[PDB]
Amino acid sequence: HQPLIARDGPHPVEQPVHNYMTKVIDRRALNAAFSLATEAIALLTGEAL
Amino acid sequence: HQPLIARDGPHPVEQPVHNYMTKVIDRRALNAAFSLATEAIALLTGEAL
């Protein structure tokens, strides 16, 4: 909500208006960081015990 | 072992890696020699008194 200043004489008279702006939200996604091998998967469960 | 980041978008997914290396020790040798004086050996060992 903007202010203004009274202005004399030959200048035209100003009047207050306002600004309401809208902005969207961007979407960002990331992915990382995991892997395994078969010799463990046999050994971590059931099979190779 | 190494740490990872969690890259986003048009790239391969970063996967965790570990690196094992084997490095071998070294053998060296030092030396010094105090050759002892002939008659003085007889003078210290006895049988010249």
From Swiss-Prot, chains A, B:
Membrane-spanning residues: none
Compartments where found: Virion; Host nucleus
Family: Belongs to the herpesviridae major capsid protein family.
Subunit structure, interactors included: Homomultimer. Makes the hexons and eleven out of twelve pentons. Interacts with triplex proteins 1/TRX1 and 2/TRX2; adjacent capsomers are linked together in groups of three by triplexes, heterotrimeric complexes composed of one molecule of TRX1 and two molecules of TRX2. Interacts with scaffold protein; this interaction allows efficient MCP transport to the host nucleus. Interacts with capsid vertex component 2/CVC2. Interacts with the small capsomere-interacting protein/SCP.
Purpose: Self-assembles to form an icosahedral capsid with a T=16 symmetry, about 200 nm in diameter, and consisting of 150 hexons and 12 pentons (total of 162 capsomers). Hexons form the edges and faces of the capsid and are each composed of six MCP molecules. In contrast, one penton is found at each of the 12 vertices. Eleven of the pentons are MCP pentamers, while the last vertex is occupied by the portal complex.
The protein, known as: Major capsid protein
Residues of the full protein shown: 100 to 148 of 1374
